[PDB]
């Protein structure tokens, strides 16, 4: 039996750290909701 607990407001943060790449990938989405790399 699952339950939910509040964790924060949904707001943009001005001081936020910036990280992560921006890859451009060919993918396929199957009937089961799973992505795979083509």
């Amino acid at each position: 039996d699952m339950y939910i607990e509040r964790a924060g407001d949904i707001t943009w943060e001005k001081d936020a750290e910036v990280t992560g790449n921006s890859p451009r990938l060919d993918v396929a989405l199957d009937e089961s909701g799973d992505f795979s790399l083509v």
């Binding site: 339950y3 509040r6 964790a7 949904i10 992560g20 990938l25 989405l29 089961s32």
Partner: protein
Amino acid sequence: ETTDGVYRVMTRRLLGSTQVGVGVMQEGVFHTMWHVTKGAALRSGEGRLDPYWGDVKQDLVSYCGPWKLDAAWDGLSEVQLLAVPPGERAKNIQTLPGIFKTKDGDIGAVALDYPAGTSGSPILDKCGRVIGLYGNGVVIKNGSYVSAITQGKR
């Protein structure tokens, strides 16, 4: 009756209290990913949240009402992942999305890696609008995880 914001999805059915995911309460409706709840009812304090819409292929589900989130990445700007990792305070991470190119068209993707129970964390534009949810993705050649920006239909 239940406040807007980001929420952990917890279960006590396993060892201890376990965070299986995350979701968004907006306009009276709770939004998360299908693989987090498998469409199960949720409790919110004393009250019960009943599934209303879901789709395994999109990997989304909404509770109490229809999917309400309709903002989309503009294809140009940085976004913020509001990551809510198990046992850890909510943290915003800014990033420029990559792209999942599919037969049915292109969607944004964010190349940020977090524990499985982080599934459902919202991705925001500079106006604070949720442009989709984190956690349905792939692992690419160099072993890194990349998640679709998964958004529903309003």
